[PDB]
Amino acid sequence: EDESEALRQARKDAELTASADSVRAYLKQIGKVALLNAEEEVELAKRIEAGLYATQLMT
Amino acid sequence: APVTHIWYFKGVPSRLGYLLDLAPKDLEKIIYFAAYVITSVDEEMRHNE
């Protein structure tokens, strides 16, 4: 079913495929990062604000 | 960025594969960004460490 080595390495092997079509390979790779919500967006925006502030301070 | 000439990578004999001792199935994965290779290793830096 899903556990007991039937589906985990199944997913790993299915993902680890040749993907001859270039668009297919790109869509396979893009299916790796989870989507984001508003709180994550504002938190990452705060992190980027801190990063650019630190870059300005370095300058 | 450098690219590979298809006439030499792809063919009935894969000339690049013959010279580098690989396979075209083990070259398309690299010159089309699907798997990495180890360009060089430090032998002594690993033997002592």
TrEMBL record, chain A:
Subcellular location: Cytoplasm
Highest taxon, organism lineage: Bacteria
Assembly notes: Interacts transiently with the RNA polymerase catalytic core.
Family the entry assigns: Belongs to the sigma-70 factor family. RpoD/SigA subfamily.
Biological role stated in the UniProt entry: Sigma factors are initiation factors that promote the attachment of RNA polymerase to specific initiation sites and are then released. This sigma factor is the primary sigma factor during exponential growth.
Record-given protein name: RNA polymerase sigma factor SigA
